[PDB]
Amino acid sequence: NLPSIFVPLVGLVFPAIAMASLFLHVQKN
Amino acid sequence: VIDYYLEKSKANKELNDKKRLATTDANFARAYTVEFGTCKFPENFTGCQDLAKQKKVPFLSEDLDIECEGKDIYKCGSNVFWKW
Amino acid sequence: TYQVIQPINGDPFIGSLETPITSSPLIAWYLSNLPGYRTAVDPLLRGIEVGLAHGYLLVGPFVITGPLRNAPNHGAVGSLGAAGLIVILSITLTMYGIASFKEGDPSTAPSLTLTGRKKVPDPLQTADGWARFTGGFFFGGISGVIWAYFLLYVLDLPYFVK
Amino acid sequence: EVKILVDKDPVKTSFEEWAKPGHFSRTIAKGPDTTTWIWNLHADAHDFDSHTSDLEEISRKVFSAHFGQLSIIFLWLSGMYFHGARFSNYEAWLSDPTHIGPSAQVVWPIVGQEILNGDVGGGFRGIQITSGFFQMWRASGITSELQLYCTAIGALIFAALMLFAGWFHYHKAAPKLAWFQDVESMLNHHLAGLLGLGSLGWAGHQVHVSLPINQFLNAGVDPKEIPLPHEFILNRDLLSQLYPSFAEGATPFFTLNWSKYAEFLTFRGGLDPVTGGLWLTDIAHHHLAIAILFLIAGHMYRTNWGIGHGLKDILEAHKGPFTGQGHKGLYEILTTSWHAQLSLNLAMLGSLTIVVAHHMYSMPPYPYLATDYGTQLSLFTHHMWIGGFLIVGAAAHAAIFMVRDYDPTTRYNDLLDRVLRHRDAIISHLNWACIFLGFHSFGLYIHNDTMSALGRPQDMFSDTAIQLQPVFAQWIQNTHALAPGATAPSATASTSLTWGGGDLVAVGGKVALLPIPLGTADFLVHHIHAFTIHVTVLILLKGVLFARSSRLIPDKANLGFRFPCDGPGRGGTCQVSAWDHVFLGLFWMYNSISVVIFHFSWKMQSDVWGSISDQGVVTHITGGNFAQSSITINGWLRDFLWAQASQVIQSYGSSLSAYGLFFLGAHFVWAFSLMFLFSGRGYWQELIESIVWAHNKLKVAPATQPRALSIVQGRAVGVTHYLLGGIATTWAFFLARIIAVG
Amino acid sequence: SVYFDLEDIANTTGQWDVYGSDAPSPYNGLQSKFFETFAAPFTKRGLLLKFLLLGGGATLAFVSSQATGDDLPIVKGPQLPPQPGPRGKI
Amino acid sequence: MRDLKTYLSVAPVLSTLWFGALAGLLIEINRFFPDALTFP
Amino acid sequence: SHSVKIYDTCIGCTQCVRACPTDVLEMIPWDGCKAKQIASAPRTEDCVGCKRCESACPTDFLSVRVYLWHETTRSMGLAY
Amino acid sequence: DISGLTPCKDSKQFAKREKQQIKKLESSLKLYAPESAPALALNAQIEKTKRRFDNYGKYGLLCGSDGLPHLIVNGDQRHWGEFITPGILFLYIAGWIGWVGRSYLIAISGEKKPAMKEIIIDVPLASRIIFRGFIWPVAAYREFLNGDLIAKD
Numbered sequence A: 001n002l003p004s005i006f007v008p009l010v011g012l013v014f015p016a017i018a019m020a021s022l023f024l025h026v027q028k029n
Numbered sequence B: 001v002i003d004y005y006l007e008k009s010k011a012n013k014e015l016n017d018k019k020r021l022a023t024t025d026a027n028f029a030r031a032y033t034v035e036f037g038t039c040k041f042p043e044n045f046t047g048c049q050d051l052a053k054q055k056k057v058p059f060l061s062e063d064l065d066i067e068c069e070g071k072d073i074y075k076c077g078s079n080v081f082w083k084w
Numbered sequence C: 001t002y003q004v005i006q007p008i009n010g011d012p013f014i015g016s017l018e019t020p021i022t023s024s025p026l027i028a029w030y031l032s033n034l035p036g037y038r039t040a041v042d043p044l045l046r047g048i049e050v051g052l053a054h055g056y057l058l059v060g061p062f063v064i065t066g067p068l069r070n071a072p073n074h075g076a077v078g079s080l081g082a083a084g085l086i087v088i089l090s091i092t093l094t095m096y097g098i099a100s101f102k103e104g105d106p107s108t109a110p111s112l113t114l115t116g117r118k119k120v121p122d123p124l125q126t127a128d129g130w131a132r133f134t135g136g137f138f139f140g141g142i143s144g145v146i147w148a149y150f151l152l153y154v155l156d157l158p159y160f161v162k
Numbered sequence D: 001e002v003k004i005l006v007d008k009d010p011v012k013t014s015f016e017e018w019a020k021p022g023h024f025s026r027t028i029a030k031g032p033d034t035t036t037w038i039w040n041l042h043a044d045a046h047d048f049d050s051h052t053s054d055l056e057e058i059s060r061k062v063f064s065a066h067f068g069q070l071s072i073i074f075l076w077l078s079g080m081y082f083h084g085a086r087f088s089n090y091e092a093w094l095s096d097p098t099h100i101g102p103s104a105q106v107v108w109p110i111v112g113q114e115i116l117n118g119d120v121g122g123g124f125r126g127i128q129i130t131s132g133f134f135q136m137w138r139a140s141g142i143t144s145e146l147q148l149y150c151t152a153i154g155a156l157i158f159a160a161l162m163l164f165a166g167w168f169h170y171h172k173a174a175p176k177l178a179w180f181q182d183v184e185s186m187l188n189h190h191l192a193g194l195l196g197l198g199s200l201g202w203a204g205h206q207v208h209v210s211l212p213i214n215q216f217l218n219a220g221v222d223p224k225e226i227p228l229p230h231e232f233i234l235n236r237d238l239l240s241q242l243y244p245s246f247a248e249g250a251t252p253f254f255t256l257n258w259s260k261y262a263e264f265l266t267f268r269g270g271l272d273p274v275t276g277g278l279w280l281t282d283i284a285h286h287h288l289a290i291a292i293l294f295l296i297a298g299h300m301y302r303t304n305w306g307i308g309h310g311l312k313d314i315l316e317a318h319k320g321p322f323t324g325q326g327h328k329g330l331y332e333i334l335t336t337s338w339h340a341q342l343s344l345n346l347a348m349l350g351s352l353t354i355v356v357a358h359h360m361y362s363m364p365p366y367p368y369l370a371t372d373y374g375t376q377l378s379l380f381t382h383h384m385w386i387g388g389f390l391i392v393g394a395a396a397h398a399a400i401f402m403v404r405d406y407d408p409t410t411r412y413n414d415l416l417d418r419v420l421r422h423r424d425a426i427i428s429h430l431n432w433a434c435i436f437l438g439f440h441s442f443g444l445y446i447h448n449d450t451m452s453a454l455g456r457p458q459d460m461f462s463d464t465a466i467q468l469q470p471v472f473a474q475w476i477q478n479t480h481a482l483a484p485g486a487t488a489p490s491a492t493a494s495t496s497l498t499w500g501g502g503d504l505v506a507v508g509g510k511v512a513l514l515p516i517p518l519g520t521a522d523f524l525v526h527h528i529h530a531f532t533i534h535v536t537v538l539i540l541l542k543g544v545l546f547a548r549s550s551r552l553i554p555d556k557a558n559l560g561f562r563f564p565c566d567g568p569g570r571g572g573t574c575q576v577s578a579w580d581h582v583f584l585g586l587f588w589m590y591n592s593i594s595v596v597i598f599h600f601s602w603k604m605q606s607d608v609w610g611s612i613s614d615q616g617v618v619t620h621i622t623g624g625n626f627a628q629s630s631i632t633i634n635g636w637l638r639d640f641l642w643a644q645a646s647q648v649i650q651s652y653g654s655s656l657s658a659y660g661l662f663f664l665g666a667h668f669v670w671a672f673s674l675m676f677l678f679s680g681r682g683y684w685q686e687l688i689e690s691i692v693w694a695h696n697k698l699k700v701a702p703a704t705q706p707r708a709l710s711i712v713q714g715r716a717v718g719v720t721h722y723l724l725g726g727i728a729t730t731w732a733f734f735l736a737r738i739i740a741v742g
Numbered sequence E: 001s002v003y004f005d006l007e008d009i010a011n012t013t014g015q016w017d018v019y020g021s022d023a024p025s026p027y028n029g030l031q032s033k034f035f036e037t038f039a040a041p042f043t044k045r046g047l048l049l050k051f052l053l054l055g056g057g058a059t060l061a062f063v064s065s066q067a068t069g070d071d072l073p074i075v076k077g078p079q080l081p082p083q084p085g086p087r088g089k090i
Numbered sequence F: 001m002r003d004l005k006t007y008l009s010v011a012p013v014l015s016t017l018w019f020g021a022l023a024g025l026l027i028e029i030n031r032f033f034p035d036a037l038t039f040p
Numbered sequence G: 001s002h003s004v005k006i007y008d009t010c011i012g013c014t015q016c017v018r019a020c021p022t023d024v025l026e027m028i029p030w031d032g033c034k035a036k037q038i039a040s041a042p043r044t045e046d047c048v049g050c051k052r053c054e055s056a057c058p059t060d061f062l063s064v065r066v067y068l069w070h071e072t073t074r075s076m077g078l079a080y
Numbered sequence H: 001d002i003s004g005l006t007p008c009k010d011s012k013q014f015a016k017r018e019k020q021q022i023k024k025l026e027s028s029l030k031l032y033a034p035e036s037a038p039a040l041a042l043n044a045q046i047e048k049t050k051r052r053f054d055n056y057g058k059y060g061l062l063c064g065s066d067g068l069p070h071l072i073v074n075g076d077q078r079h080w081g082e083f084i085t086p087g088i089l090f091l092y093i094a095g096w097i098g099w100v101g102r103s104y105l106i107a108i109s110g111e112k113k114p115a116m117k118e119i120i121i122d123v124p125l126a127s128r129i130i131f132r133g134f135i136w137p138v139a140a141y142r143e144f145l146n147g148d149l150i151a152k153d
């Protein structure tokens, strides 16, 4: 039910979004 | 010829085995002479090998005596002199 | 005598050398005719070509070496994996474009040829040009993955390795 | 003109410089102020080109040092022969080499150490030796202990001769610089004189002393009734019975009927089934052909008569459109720099030692060597280590030449200049190759480990899974197995039993050699080997190429060859000298050689070595577990390190108890090295500052002020202890395992 | 003979376009019009990043939620009776 | 003669002579009084 | 840019200046020492921080001191 | 006895260890002629083991439940031969060495270059100093009272 949806979100999608945001933050100015 | 020296070795197997045992036993006892009490302080002024032919130390003299036996005058490979 | 290796563009104090690998007419023509070096054309079409090549090439490894390679559904699963890789690559391209180029700034590409002749710098090194390039890359890559799947598992052509 | 050129009485023989430590250098001769001096004396002892700038003076010193080294080697050989003659069971091993273990060391009965005299058989107690001297002595025809005593005496006499020669040639007749630079004469004499005549003499000994005595031994006659070697020269009739061709004398040799000598000069291949080694008739013919080849080779260069070549002439004629002037200028470099010659010779010798190690196991030359597994493993590992160390020294001395003797204004060479003008391309390409090889070699092991741990054996890289077959090596093996029939028609068998000729040689119920199969696991280890070799090459070549300068340090040459750093500037400049690069490359050489010897040990114990019964069934030591277990790191950890260490850890209370003690000692020294490798001298000098206070409080502070070790010296100590501990761990583990189970 | 000009720093420092080609478009006009029409929505870099990240995450979650036991062993679940513990624990 | 005596007084030579004498003394004591765990 | 400072324990033997790899230091007139000259660091923006001057300092303690500070492209010795 | 240990003359594990050692030594005796030198060497080891175990019995050592001697250090008057007397002898030898070193370091301190007598040792001076350690406790005590032991800085 939930694990099949939550594990890809926490293990792949959230790290990707956080990495993209952090990279755009550190490359500013 | 090979099958003549095979005959020679057949007749002298026991004698050569007694040479092997003596020469290995002397080689081992060379490291144990002092503990045995054979070659030590007052008589080791020269080599225990030298004492072997003048004092008859137990194990280094059996090898000397057996070393050449049944061999000719100039055909013992373990002693240059043998029967000079 | 006759030496083959020469300093780059005749300048001995630029950190490069001219070798047959780098300066032969065949390789020079081949590199000049790749979509990555077509300066005077819309970057969107170049990105379309690049994506069409790369997404098409990416299908094979996923389909054949994947965990479900021995399943009857291996082709579709591998094509989906290749499409996901294309999506990730497009995300990386968009990230690089946003981080590297501001909207108003001009191009960072060189404005001189090897002969010193002034040219128009490549619009690919601008924000709009890079955005068009990555959009074309995404569209081409998805289409290439779909085309490889259609050729391999919809028409089932007698390819030796499938 | 080539002629003898000497100087008479150049250096006076006196004890006055023995009483003045550090006399050889200006700085050290003044005496010590701190403890650093004590180390500086030993580090600069043999750095002759730093003592004087005179090339002749340096050359005389190296010439005498070589004589000293030769004297030491002769002393070592004399000791080996004397211990074989006096403290060994060689004469008993001769009559039963399959059931008696060689031993030439007997310990004294003190503090309970007499347990090391184990039962090696033959009514003898001692320490089992793995040098292989017994098989070499049997091959040479040595039969009694008396002939070993005479060899020891002769080696002692020769050692005295070399020592006297060194003294005489440094103090009485010192050759001039022109004598050393006569490279054509030296090459001619070393090719024709040393090697050719040496091999010719050894061939004569083999056809006169070795072949007949070994024919008697292999026939099963007692060693004590074999005729003495000189008896095979005195009456030629004894030699005309084993080989009737000897009745013809030397007439066939001079009339060009050489096939008449086919009885004792053969081209067979394979191994002697009674012996398990190469046919002696093959070896004698090999040496006789090598003698002629080298005697003809040693006539290539021009010395005093018109005929011959000029080395400079050959060098200056090899140039092309890509290499400019070519090799012009190399003759001047190689005739004025000792370090370049040392570098080249070290590289070649280290490479040749590895080839020797590879060839001796696949073609056992000595009798009863193949079935003595402990000797084979020890010889292979020893020669691999020697080769690796010499190869590393080659890079070290190439870097030294680059730092000191390189001078484009007077000794320009186009090839070296062009190499230095694109070093970035070389180093970056080697970097990429190293990364690619590391991934595609080691990450396959990680993939296999993860698949096995996840319950997916069908997704691994294995022979029962996704295959990676070494097809090229398999094709080479098949080609070499078919050589006797099509490409080497005069040969009877292939050059080795490992090519695949579908035969196995068994001696004394033990497997000598058999066709070695290659599969996926071998494909993995070979690329692992290539990766480590490439990384070592990268580390050493980067140090050699960037020794003079880099973009970080434009003037790295003025800092010397061996300096710690250039300060914390530019982000940090630690270990930028060429010395550091050798210091780092020693670790990778150690890693590579350790993996190679582990591969050899596991493969031999799993697929070659074993036992054979009187039914035709072969049972290997580890039962062919290499193919399915050597493909995961867990396999190496469990089935090789854990399984085969069970011997050395249960050797206490036996004759092998000295190997467990050395096992623990090697572990301790290896751990000890990490204190030096992980720290720095600034902490230790401050710690010493407090101890000096405690000594001054009690008026026991020494005048020689205690100093922490220098930055470079700490690295040297750390790497030396690391290498010693690592190599000794494997020495003890291998010896215990292969003596207990072999 | 000289490679240092203060008026031309780009030439002096090697700011050249080595393999860049100024040739016109080698693509056909109709094909370029088709691609320009049907790839225009993906040329907004701000929109593309958000769309790719969010849609890819949603698609990944949906596909993981629609996987069957044939595709994933973890979805199939255990099929064998469980093993017992070392000293009778369950 | 004087110089050779000076050399024989250098640290390593004196050290090896001293430790050799010490090792010989300890070895002979252990040979004639072996296996000593206590002091009677 | 790193910080380079000079203290009046200077004896003016000019050892630091000729050990500078980037020409940061120079000698200026003075009256506090027999040599009538003291060191100065007017170009610390070219300082790399290799501390070669302190290795050439004869005074005890050092008369020239280098403090590693904010890093620039010049201070890290980068040519790319 | 002390700490639940039994004397090694009473404990059966000690005798069992002695029997097993002799049995292990006698198994290798079977592989040699009764008159050979290795047979004579293993017999000497057997006598050495017998003497060792008999001595350990006679000295009055305490053995644990494993048959091995255990040392008693707390200060018991019947166990001074295991730590106290050997410790006193060690402290006499080490103080001797330290005092001879200190006197030699003091004797060469007042010279032109005293670092040369630290790498090239003045052997006659060392011979003079060496035998002063036989009375090292008395001198070490006496420079404590006067104040020639500690440098007051």
Ligand code: CLA
Pocket: A007, A008, A010, A011, A012, A013, A016, C066, C067, C068, C077, C078, C080, C081, C083, C084, C085, C087, C088, E052, E053, E054, E055, E056, E057, E059, E060, E063, E064, E071
């Ligand atoms: C928690 C972290 C996590 C998770 C959930 C997964 C999950 C997965 N990995 Mg994986 N992986 C991870 C971390 C993770 N990985 C890390 C850290 C490494 C490096 C060591 C790897 C290395 C790795 C390898 C080498 C492989 C996998 C594979 C797989 C898949 C195996 C299932 C299968 O057989 O179906 C197979 C199903 C397909 C091939 C079809 C997938 C189609 C997807 C669902 C399309 C959607 C993609 C989406 C649009 C992109 C979103 C990106 C995001 C940034 C927005 C599964 C999706 C295997 C695989 O086949 O995946 C490609 C495979 O070969 N992984």
Ligand code: CLA
Pocket: B030, B031, D075, D076, D078, D079, D080, D082, D087, D105, D106, D107, D108, F016, F017, F020, F021, F024
């Ligand atoms: C590399 C060559 C080499 C090596 C490693 C060995 C090694 C060995 N030999 Mg050997 N040997 C060699 C060459 C070699 N030998 C040669 C060339 C000969 C022919 C001359 C011999 C002849 C020989 C004999 C005849 C014997 C050995 C023995 C031994 C073993 C014991 C040695 C020993 O305790 O020294 C003895 C100790 C010393 C020599 C003392 C070291 C001297 C140094 C300089 C320190 C001096 C300090 C001094 C001891 C203190 C007192 C000085 C005084 C002023 C107070 C040992 C395994 C013995 C053996 O195996 O017994 C079973 C034995 O009986 N060897």
Ligand code: CLA
Pocket: D062, D063, D066, D067, D070, D179, D180, D182, D183, D185, D186, D189, D190, D192, D193, D194
């Ligand atoms: C046929 C003549 C001949 C032979 C046999 C040799 C042999 C050797 N030379 Mg040599 N050399 C020769 C001619 C020859 N040279 C000439 C003509 C020159 C001048 C161009 C040199 C210049 C030269 C140098 C500069 C060096 C050598 C070195 C060596 C040794 C290398 C180490 C080795 O392989 O150990 C093999 C060991 C043996 C074979 C043991 C036996 C020793 C041999 C028999 C002694 C050689 C005697 C010699 C040829 C003449 C003696 C003079 C006479 C008055 C007694 C080796 C002994 C190196 C060395 O180690 O120096 C000591 C070295 O540095 N040689």
Ligand code: CLA
Pocket: D042, D043, D044, D045, D046, D047, D048, D342, D389, D390, D391, D392, D393, D394, D396, D400, D562, D579, D582, D720
């Ligand atoms: C025939 C080979 C050969 C020769 C002639 C030389 C000669 C030289 N080397 Mg060299 N080298 C060699 C091989 C060789 N090396 C190899 C194989 C390596 C790789 C490991 C090196 C690595 C190397 C470096 C890195 C350096 C030299 C240096 C030097 C020069 C100074 C040597 C000196 O004073 O040492 C004095 C000798 C010592 C301080 C003794 C060291 C003792 C070692 C570390 C212990 C070895 C462990 C031992 C085997 C185990 C004993 C156990 C213990 C318990 C007793 C000199 C010209 C140095 C230099 O400045 O060159 C100009 C330098 O920096 N070499």
Ligand code: CLA
Pocket: D431, D432, D434, D435, D436, D437, D438, D439, D442, D443, D446, D535, D538, D539, D584, D587, D588
């Ligand atoms: C086991 C420890 C270890 C490891 C793994 C490495 C690894 C490496 N060293 Mg090394 N090194 C070590 C110890 C180690 N070192 C020690 C102790 C020393 C001191 C002597 C050195 C000294 C040293 C020097 C002097 C040099 C190296 C070099 C290298 C590189 C060689 C290129 C290569 O193989 O890349 C391939 C990478 C690997 C094999 C690492 C493992 C990767 C596997 C496949 C897993 C990856 C999966 C995936 C990426 C995970 C992503 C998941 C995500 C969540 C992050 C590599 C990075 C050389 C270098 O930089 O050349 C390029 C070099 O010059 N090292």
Ligand code: CLA
Pocket: D690, D691, D692, D694, D695, D698, D700, H097, H098, H099, H100, H101, H102, H104, H105, H121, H126, H129
């Ligand atoms: C004259 C010799 C001498 C004397 C009297 C002392 C005395 C002392 N040392 Mg010391 N030390 C010495 C030599 C000496 N040391 C040497 C040579 C070294 C270098 C290895 C050290 C290294 C050292 C350290 C690292 C430490 C001490 C400490 C100490 C103090 C506590 C005792 C201790 O830990 O001993 C232990 C002593 C040693 C480990 C070294 C002993 C070395 C030998 C036995 C001395 C030989 C002297 C000489 C060769 C003989 C002279 C011959 C002459 C007649 C010709 C104490 C004041 C400790 C301290 O400050 O705490 C208060 C401490 O941490 N020492």
